[PDB]
Amino acid sequence: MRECISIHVGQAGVQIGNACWELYCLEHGIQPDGQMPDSFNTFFSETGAGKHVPRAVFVDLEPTVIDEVRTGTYRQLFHPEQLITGKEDAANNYARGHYTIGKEIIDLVLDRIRKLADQCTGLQGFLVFHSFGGGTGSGFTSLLMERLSVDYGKKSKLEFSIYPAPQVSTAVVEPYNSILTTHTTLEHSDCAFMVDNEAIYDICRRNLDIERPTYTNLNRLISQIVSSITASLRFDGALNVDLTEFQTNLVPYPRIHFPLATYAPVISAEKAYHEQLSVAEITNACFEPANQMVKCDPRHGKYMACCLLYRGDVVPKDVNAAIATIKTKRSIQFVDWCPTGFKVGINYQPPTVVPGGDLAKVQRAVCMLSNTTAIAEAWARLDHKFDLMYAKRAFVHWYVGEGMEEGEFSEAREDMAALEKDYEEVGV
Amino acid sequence: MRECISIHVGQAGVQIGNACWELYCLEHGIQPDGQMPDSFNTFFSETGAGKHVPRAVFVDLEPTVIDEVRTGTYRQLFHPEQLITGKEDAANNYARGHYTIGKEIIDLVLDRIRKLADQCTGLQGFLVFHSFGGGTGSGFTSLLMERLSVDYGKKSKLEFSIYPAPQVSTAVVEPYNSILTTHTTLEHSDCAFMVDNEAIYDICRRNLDIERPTYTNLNRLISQIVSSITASLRFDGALNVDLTEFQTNLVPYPRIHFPLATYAPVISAEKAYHEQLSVAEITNACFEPANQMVKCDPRHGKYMACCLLYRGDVVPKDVNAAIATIKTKRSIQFVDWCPTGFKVGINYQPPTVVPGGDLAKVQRAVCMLSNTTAIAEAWARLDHKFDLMYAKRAFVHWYVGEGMEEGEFSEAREDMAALEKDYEEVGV
Amino acid sequence: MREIVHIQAGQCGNQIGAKFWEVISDEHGIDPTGTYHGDSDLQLDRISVYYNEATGGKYVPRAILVDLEPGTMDSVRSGPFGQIFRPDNFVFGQSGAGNNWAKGHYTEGAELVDSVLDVVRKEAESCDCLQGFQLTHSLGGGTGSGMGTLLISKIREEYPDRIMNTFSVVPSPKVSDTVVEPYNATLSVHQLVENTDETYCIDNEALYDICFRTLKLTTPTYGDLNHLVSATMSGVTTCLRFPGQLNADLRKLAVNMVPFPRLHFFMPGFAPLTSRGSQQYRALTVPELTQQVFDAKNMMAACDPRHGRYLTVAAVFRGRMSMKEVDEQMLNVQNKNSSYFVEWIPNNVKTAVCDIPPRGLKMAVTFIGNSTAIQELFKRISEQFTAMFRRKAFLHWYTGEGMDEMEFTEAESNMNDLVSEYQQYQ
Ligand SMILES: Nc1nc2c(ncn2[C@@H]2O[C@H](COP(=O)(O)CP(=O)(O)OP(=O)(O)O)[C@@H](O)[C@H]2O)c(=O)[nH]1
Ligand SMILES: Nc1nc2c(ncn2[C@@H]2O[C@H](COP(=O)(O)OP(=O)(O)OP(=O)(O)O)[C@@H](O)[C@H]2O)c(=O)[nH]1
Ligand SMILES: Nc1nc2c(ncn2[C@@H]2O[C@H](COP(=O)(O)OP(=O)(O)OP(=O)(O)O)[C@@H](O)[C@H]2O)c(=O)[nH]1
Ligand SMILES: [Mg+2]
Ligand SMILES: [Mg+2]
Ligand SMILES: [Mg+2]
Incomplete structure (x- = not known):
């Protein structure tokens, strides 16, 4: 009965999405052909007799990344109506994606979305994968987001965004991109989750013991996290956490809706034999500064709310104990106005593992999405970066050429600045 | 018991007709020989013992297009009495077809028609395929139409006309041709359906995924549509829609009798596996601006009446729901005086598919013939085109030579102008 | 004679019912099909109070099952004695509350209740003389709280002269499931003051304690809890369903323990x-x-x-x-x-x-x-509410459904007053 629509924007979204799809397929016992040799009804619709098509829309302005899917193993899973393709790319620019190029493609996709959305009956909410630093992932997303409030509004939305790093970042004009695209995110998006590549890289190195990671290792990691959000829908545990419920729980104010994720345990195949995975230990792992998905400092931060989601062999008896222990500790700390700050989910289904996967096959797993003042400090340096770039009008002429007025920049920076103080106000 | 007489005028009519005939043959399990190894009694009369001859009359002023049929595979299906041939062609002129050349051939054919018509007992109505822009399809048809009101009158008539396009049109003098031939259509023809090649072409490109279409692909498409009109006669569904009934339903006024068609679904063989064909989706497809048979705008238009005809696996339970949904939507809208505006037909027989066909084999299919104010705007530009051509007396001398008086033009333009306002009056 | 129809709501309440019903069946001797296999004759003389005798000797449970989502109703059918329940009586929506009493009580629940308000009437008609309704739900979330609360007050208009039972599960400080417990509790309790005749306040923190030490169970689950809770229910209505040397029905109990x-x-x-x-x-x-x-x-x-x-x-x-x-x-x-x-x-x-x-x-x-x-149970809740409400936290979910900030303080005041009534006579 329940249903949810996935959207994938830009190259990053596409790249991430494939892995997720694969994971999903693995979960429900479906080969690339789309015929299974119920629970899966949410993401897959059964066409006629034994053809499982995904709830998906891949947008891209190049053909390269989309044609990668059309020629590979998952050629049979999708059809050309689902896979939309542009001509001229975003070219790592917000202005190209939103104003000039964005008019033509969005129109095509909205109809498609409607066709997909009206087919399903129980719309829970949307998922939108992209990157803030990316061209298509910023300019188009903003447009798209704006559009989606007209047709739906109250129907929920989520987005798992690749946040830019201060040290290890693979593009020069990223600062600009972030600042602009966050203007639409505050008004339209209900709750956006944030991940940083640098953070991931460290995790990959230290715990998995693979000193040569590429994007395919990160994508897999991300997919697990994604699953851990939607695992409550597709399987019937003793206690359940729907998306609306989650939203109600984690997000306190209209301005703040930027929690950060974390995932544990993540360890090698050889390390699983020695390491006795206890519940308490895994709980601890979520609160460690080393295992966070964003470059942040939990020591400075304070958790307003955070939603735990267990899957595998778990029961409430020791969960309670775990909860209590954390509360007792003073290294972890909360804001004065929130005495009780957790939302706890359980699931019987164990988390699956991919053929030739870096992660070990485990009984238990955890995913904590914490709203905090730790991520408030992350944009203070972003702003600084941005400001310097702007101060001498660097890279501005390109933007101007694409139809961006000069006041737009003023609007987006000031707003950002204003927002930074909000966290402070809340946490006083 | 029931019967209907098909007429084919001009090259276009001939070309269209062959495909239709083929389709018909396929439907009832008859090879080109005419001996089957009941339902078919309408279009085929059984001669002696196992010889099925069609209810048909092909008129043409050249020998080329008619001799194409005589030499091909369907040489055995027809005999020279059915196939009439001229000497001098219409030469893309209305005046040549009606006044000069039209006297000699029509006489021959009327007798033939009588011979065919008096043989059958249950005359439902006539079918006349042609093009407005064509020479023979305009000049002869007008004459023919005029003639047919003397012998029959109340007995029904239909015509599936190839309407000219404003952009992609393959003849210079087409504007003139249209304007003249519509004078006879208003008085004589009971209801004329209109299709534009440009519209078809788009459909062929986008949905069928064949970027190199020729006339043979359009003809096939047309034939399906044609079948969808007559499918109610030849097969016994739960609910039926005869021609008279249809006429009663769709046509409200004496002046307006120009509905437009649409057909769905039309998709590739590979696209059928992924795309789960639902009823609602197919209903939607008929109301989409992309799938219309004429260059028009449903967004500006308002549907006075429109007759749905389902064939294949359909039952009334979800049909009702579909109907309701459309009513509820405000993008689709009706005229104030018509609260209930649909006529719904059902059929058990699935729509057949041609050997080596572009269309995929499907369970369900729909055909909506909608009377609307959208097609009212289509002639506003035609008039403009015509007017400019006329303004400097361009191409007029040829017409004059063939015995066309100058006042004829005046008569046909003014009338057309008058007609354009009628729609407006009705829709206020 | 003397029948009691049962109502259920929420994820937990439904679960409890599922077990409770099973236990009651076991006590009388009803099987999954419904046909009677028991030996002791006194199980069949008061079978009428909790079971309508249908055609072919197959008894059916006098119940109403309510939820704002279809998820929980799946496992109830597949489990033991899911086949005994009547298909007609299951009611469910497609929306869901989302752990919000504001959504549950006004917008979402009021669309679903009109089906139940027609279904209960039929049940009432069916029995000779209904004496009261049992109700099972939670106050922690929005689904069991908002719906049940909405329902129970509208029963008092049609049936003012009948006894009203409510088996709730209030929140604990240590074992906190949701963040917005203080809110939901604060508002849900308000209506349960004037509308109910008696209420049993259960808490999971105590249940756990009971389990670990007394029963010495190494791996407790929710099933155990359900079993426990159901036992209590079985106990209170034992005098109606069986004979005794000194019988005590519900009304008597109410009269005695509610001064x-x-x-x-x-x-x-x-x-x-x-x-x-x-x-x-x-x-x-x-x-x-x-x-x-x-x-x-x-x-x-x-x-x-x-x-x-x-x-x-x-x-x-x-x-x-x-x-x-x-x-x-x-x-x-x-x-x-x-x-x-x-x-x-x-x-x-x-x-x-x-x-x-x-x-x-x-x-x-x-x-x-x-x-x-019971002051200790409520006092903490009140404190939590105060902590929350001071900064207007988690408010835009409740204010979005058309609830003024005064409307919180109206219920809050009432709650405070209620709390005080215990400290008047202590
Ligand atoms: N005795 C039991 N208690 C339970 C069980 N499941 C949950 N709970 C307790 O009940 C509380 C949660 O109650 P619910 O899940 O019914 C909240 P509700 O259904 O009304 O709203 P939604 O969850 O938004 O549908 C929580 O504090 C748990 O400690 C159970 O199976 N047995
Ligand atoms: N974790 C992760 N990050 C990625 C991946 N691909 C790209 N990124 C990040 O996203 C940013 C680049 O964004 P793209 O998605 O390439 O840009 P785009 O929005 O597609 O715009 P165009 O490239 O102009 O089409 C970089 O900062 C990368 O670190 C991936 O597969 N995994
Ligand atoms: N859809 C479709 N349109 C056609 C076909 N053949 C011709 N037409 C259209 O009809 C118009 C030409 O008319 P014809 O039928 O060739 O002219 P005619 O009436 O036979 O007169 P003559 O050619 O002088 O004998 C053009 O505008 C074409 O687009 C066909 O097979 N399919
Ligand atoms: Mg790119
Ligand atoms: Mg010709
Ligand atoms: Mg629930």
């Missing part, structure tokens, strides 16, 4: 609770049963009962017992604990005895108490 209009919240308790080890060595006799019953740690409400006095006290014993043994023990207890019973209501005790015991156990005791120690 004042606004003070009717009770705390359940159950005995004997024995592990595999304590099954052999514990001498199950009346005195033993008694002493265990009045222990602070044996309660289902996570409080300290000995901070204040019991206003009233009642018990429902099962199996054959000598009355001088039974009636003396209570007296003795009273004598002992002269500082833990109210002085201006002398003789606080109420007793009831049934001849038919639970299958397996020889004897049983269901403890329903009314105390001034």
Whole structure:
């Protein structure tokens, strides 16, 4: 009965999405052909007799990344109506994606979305994968987001965004991109989750013991996290956490809706034999500064709310104990106005593992999405970066050429600045 | 018991007709020989013992297009009495077809028609395929139409006309041709359906995924549509829609009798596996601006009446729901005086598919013939085109030579102008 | 004669019902198809109170199952004695509350309730003389709270002269499921003050405690909890369903244990609770049963009962017992604990005895108490609410459904007043 629509924007979204799809397929016992040799009804619709098509829309302005899917193993899973393709790319620019190029493609996709959305009956909410630093992932997303409030509004939305790093970042004009695209995110998006590549890289190195990671290792990691959000829908545990419920729980104010994720345990195949995975230990792992998905400092931060989601062999008896222990500790700390700050989910289904996967096959797993003042400090340096770039009008002429007025920049920076103080106000 | 007489005028009519005939043959399990190894009694009369001859009359002023049929595979299906041939062609002129050349051939054919018509007992109505822009399809048809009101009158008539396009049109003098031939259509023809090649072409490109279409692909498409009109006669569904009934339903006024068609679904063989064909989706497809048979705008238009005809696996339970949904939507809208505006037909027989066909084999299919104010705007530009051509007396001398008086033009333009306002009056 | 239709709501309440129903069936001897296989004849004379005798000797449960999502109704059908339930009586929506009482009580629940308000009527008509409705739900979330609350007040318009029971599950400070418990609780309690006749406040924190120490269970689950909770329900309505030397129905109990209009919240308790080890060595006799019953740690409400006095006290014993043994023990207890019973209501005790015991156990005791120690349960909640409401946190979800900030303080005030009523007579 329940249903949810996935959207994938830009190259990053596409790249991430494939892995997720694969994971999903693995979960429900479906080969690339789309015929299974119920629970899966949410993401897959059964066409006629034994053809499982995904709830998906891949947008891209190049053909390269989309044609990668059309020629590979998952050629049979999708059809050309689902896979939309542009001509001229975003070219790592917000202005190209939103104003000039964005008019033509969005129109095509909205109809498609409607066709997909009206087919399903129980719309829970949307998922939108992209990157803030990316061209298509910023300019188009903003447009798209704006559009989606007209047709739906109250129907929920989520987005798992690749946040830019201060040290290890693979593009020069990223600062600009972030600042602009966050203007639409505050008004339209209900709750956006944030991940940083640098953070991931460290995790990959230290715990998995693979000193040569590429994007395919990160994508897999991300997919697990994604699953851990939607695992409550597709399987019937003793206690359940729907998306609306989650939203109600984690997000306190209209301005703040930027929690950060974390995932544990993540360890090698050889390390699983020695390491006795206890519940308490895994709980601890979520609160460690080393295992966070964003470059942040939990020591400075304070958790307003955070939603735990267990899957595998778990029961409430020791969960309670775990909860209590954390509360007792003073290294972890909360804001004065929130005495009780957790939302706890359980699931019987164990988390699956991919053929030739870096992660070990485990009984238990955890995913904590914490709203905090730790991520408030992350944009203070972003702003600084941005400001310097702007101060001498660097890279501005390109933007101007694409139809961006000069006041737009003023609007987006000031707003950002204003927002930074909000966290402070809340946490006083 | 029931019967209907098909007429084919001009090259276009001939070309269209062959495909239709083929389709018909396929439907009832008859090879080109005419001996089957009941339902078919309408279009085929059984001669002696196992010889099925069609209810048909092909008129043409050249020998080329008619001799194409005589030499091909369907040489055995027809005999020279059915196939009439001229000497001098219409030469893309209305005046040549009606006044000069039209006297000699029509006489021959009327007798033939009588011979065919008096043989059958249950005359439902006539079918006349042609093009407005064509020479023979305009000049002869007008004459023919005029003639047919003397012998029959109340007995029904239909015509599936190839309407000219404003952009992609393959003849210079087409504007003139249209304007003249519509004078006879208003008085004589009971209801004329209109299709534009440009519209078809788009459909062929986008949905069928064949970027190199020729006339043979359009003809096939047309034939399906044609079948969808007559499918109610030849097969016994739960609910039926005869021609008279249809006429009663769709046509409200004496002046307006120009509905437009649409057909769905039309998709590739590979696209059928992924795309789960639902009823609602197919209903939607008929109301989409992309799938219309004429260059028009449903967004500006308002549907006075429109007759749905389902064939294949359909039952009334979800049909009702579909109907309701459309009513509820405000993008689709009706005229104030018509609260209930649909006529719904059902059929058990699935729509057949041609050997080596572009269309995929499907369970369900729909055909909506909608009377609307959208097609009212289509002639506003035609008039403009015509007017400019006329303004400097361009191409007029040829017409004059063939015995066309100058006042004829005046008569046909003014009338057309008058007609354009009628729609407006009705829709206020 | 004397029928009680059962209502259910929420994820937990439904689960409880699922087990409760099973237990009741076991007690009478009904099988998954519905056909009777029992031997003892007295199970069939009061079968009518909880089972309509349908065609072909197949009995059916007089119940209403409500939810704002279809998820929980899947596992109820597939489990044991899911086939006994009637297909007609299941009611469910496609939306869901999302742990919000504002959405549950006004927008989402009011669309679903009109189906149930028609379904209950039929049930009422069916029985000869309905005496009351049982209701099972939670106050923690929005689904069980908002819907049930909405329902229960509209029953008082049609049926003002009937007794009203409510089996709730209030939030704990340590085992906190959701973040917005204080909010939901604060608003959901308001309507349960004036509309209900009696309410049993259960808390999971106490249940866990009971499980770990007393039953010595290595791996508890929610199933165990459900089993426990259901037992209490079975206990209260034993006198209706079976004969006894001294019978005590619901109305009588209500009259006895509710002295004042606004003070009717009770705390359940159950005995004997024995592990595999304590099954052999514990001498199950009346005195033993008694002493265990009045222990602070044996309660289902996570409080300290000995901070204040019991206003009233009642018990429902099962199996054959000598009355001088039974009636003396209570007296003795009273004598002992002269500082833990109210002085201006002398003789606080109420007793009831049934001849038919639970299958397996020889004897049983269901403890329903009314105390001034319920202040500790509410006080904490109030504090939490204050902490939350000071900064207007988590407010835009509630204000989005058309609720003013005054409307919180209206209920809050009421709650405070209610709390005070215990500290008036302590
Ligand atoms: N005795 C039991 N208690 C339970 C069970 N499941 C949950 N709970 C308790 O109940 C509380 C949650 O109650 P619910 O899940 O019914 C909240 P509700 O359904 O009304 O709203 P939604 O969850 O938004 O549908 C929580 O504090 C748990 O401690 C159970 O199976 N048995
Ligand atoms: N974790 C992760 N990050 C990625 C991946 N691909 C790209 N990124 C990040 O996203 C940013 C680049 O964004 P793209 O998605 O390439 O840009 P785009 O929005 O597609 O715009 P165009 O490239 O102009 O089409 C970089 O900062 C990368 O670190 C991936 O597979 N995994
Ligand atoms: N859809 C479709 N349109 C056609 C076909 N053949 C011709 N037409 C259209 O009809 C018009 C030409 O008319 P014809 O039928 O060739 O002219 P005619 O009436 O036979 O007169 P003559 O050619 O002088 O004998 C053009 O505008 C074409 O687009 C066909 O097979 N399919
Ligand atoms: Mg790119
Ligand atoms: Mg020709
Ligand atoms: Mg629920």
